Amino acid sequence: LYFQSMFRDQVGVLAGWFKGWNECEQTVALLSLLKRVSQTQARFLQLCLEHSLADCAELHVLEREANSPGIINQWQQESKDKVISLLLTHLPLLKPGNLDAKVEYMKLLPKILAHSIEHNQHIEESRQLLSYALIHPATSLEDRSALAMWLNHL
Amino acid sequence: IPTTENLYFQSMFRDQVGVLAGWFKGWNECEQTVALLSLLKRVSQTQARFLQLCLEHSLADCAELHVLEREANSPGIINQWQQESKDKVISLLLTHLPLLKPGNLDAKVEYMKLLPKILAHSIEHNQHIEESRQLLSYALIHPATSLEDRSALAMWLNHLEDRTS
């Protein structure tokens, strides 16, 4: 592709910043740009992502787990470290219209945050979980109010 | 909002996102799409799926978009566009090619027939050069195009750049 030299330089700066960001930062920055594109650009990028992920078998296994309210509910029987691991790897795969699964994620979070905010442990994981919950289209305004108060307490 | 415990890092992240927003607002739609693709290729499968779900949610009930998508994936409709004025064909291709579904082979064949016709006219008459470059760029990054398609599209792009330089 033939591009303006300034644009090439800016994309180079972008790549450097992106490599230095954590995954939460990367996701948030990308969302900050995807909110500004046209519906047609958004659909094109959606098609690109769908094409790239179409035959990702391991991803599909995680997605099914992430959308199974019974599976999610059972995670309360795991150690704190494992539940935080499960939430971080599965919450981004929750489908926006899966209300029953969403409810099970919202039931597990306040238990994990209390322990973390008390034993000053996994606070970053807790912060990454609250960030992902706050930007997840599945969460309601009432969910997001609760999520915000849990951030204030943290 | 909170992405780091480090207060210095949190403030610098916000600064960077601001600069990014300013750059993005000044980019044309082709630059924006290419810049976004240059980041999406770097994310994990899980990040990619999350962003995909967000896009799908935002677009789910976009009625006017859906009308354009149906046109963009109808080979008979696309084929008829060759009867339109060169200005209209350029406009139709710009607005519909990004909506072509990656496995719609028959629709893709019709785009690959129309693109050389509008590029030959643009090169001969020194018109629509920017739009032609954008159409070729979109086609070259389009998940629907094959490696053979992209060899042909690169041929056309080099010819356009050679004839306009």
Header resolution in angstroms: 1.6
Listed in sequence order, the residues at least 6 apart from A74 whose beta carbon sits closer than 8 Å to its beta carbon are none
> Rounded CA gap, B103 and B37, in Å?
19
State the smallest CA–CA distance between residue B63 and chain A in angstroms.
11
Residue A12 structure tokens: 């180079």
A contacts of B39 (beta carbons < 8 Å): 14-15, 18, 26, 29-30
Interface of A with B in 91-110 (CB under 8 A): 92-93, 95-97
Q: Which residue reads 């064909």 in tokens?
A: B89
> Rounded CA gap, A90 and B102, in Å?
27
HEC assignment per residue over B43-93: CCHHHHHHHHHHHHHHHCCCHHHHHHHHHHCCHHHHHHHHHCCHHHHHHHH
Side chain identity at residue A139, one-letter code: T
For residue A22, give the nearest of B3, B24, B48 by CB distance.
B3
Residue A1 structure tokens: 């592709």
Residue A130 structure tokens: 């609250």
Contact (CB<8Å) B58/A41: no
Chain-centroid distance, C-alpha B40: 14
A contacts of B111 (beta carbons < 8 Å): none
A contacts of B62 (beta carbons < 8 Å): 39
Experimental method: X-ray
Q: What is the DSSP string of A102-120?
A: HHHHHHHHHHHHHHHHHTT
Q: Domain locations in chain B? A: 28-60, 63-165
Question: Most distant CA pair in chain B: distance in Å?
Answer: 61
HSE, CB side, 13 Å, CA atoms: give it for residue A37. Answer: 26
Which of A45, A64, A134, A140 to substitute to test the interface with B, most B CBs within 10 Å?
Answer: A45
3-state secondary structure of A94: coil
> Rounded CA gap, B58 and A35, in Å?
9
Listed in sequence order, the residues at least 6 apart from A67 whose beta carbon sits closer than 8 Å to its beta carbon are A93, A94, A95, A98, A101
Q: Is B126 left (phi over 0), alpha (psi -120 to 50) or beta?
A: left
Contact (CB<8Å) A45/B36: yes
Nearest to B52 by CA among A63, A48, A67: A48
A124 and B82 Cβ atoms separated by less than 8 Å: no
